[PDB]
Design brief:
This protein is about 65% helix and about 10% strand. The chain has about 160 residues and is mostly helical. A hairpin with a 5-residue loop joins strand 1 and strand 2.
Length: about 160
Amino acid sequence: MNIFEMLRIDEGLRLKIYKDTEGYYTIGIGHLLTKSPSLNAAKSELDKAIGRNCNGVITKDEAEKLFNQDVDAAVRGILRNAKLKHVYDSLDAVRRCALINMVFQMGETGVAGFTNSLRMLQQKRWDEAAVNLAKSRWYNQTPNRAKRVITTFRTGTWDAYKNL
């Protein structure tokens, strides 16, 4: 398993504009288009993103393109963020994937707000940190996903995704 396989399990694949768990306009593999309520604003962003007139729908190919950019941006974001980079560099390969997943879903800013858990992950207090991450809006809103990410940080293995 790798970051891409992991995220594609968590996000799914949709070739037509759809709404987030949050009600936001998205397409592809978890690519948010706009937080705005108009499908029209969403369509506009989509064509902007792809470089063609999509009319709300893209090919697999385009979805994968967006996905590659999004993963790259996530990693780059981690590396540029002081807070983030420190934890990242401290982690093993599997756990690094769990931090990337969080950043992909919630953004740099969002993850950097998990101050206490980040501290615990740095210290390698896996069990403590798993308990602390669960105390969040994130876990309450998308529990099955948060819990896969969480077991990932807890164990350092891919077991949560083997099922899936």
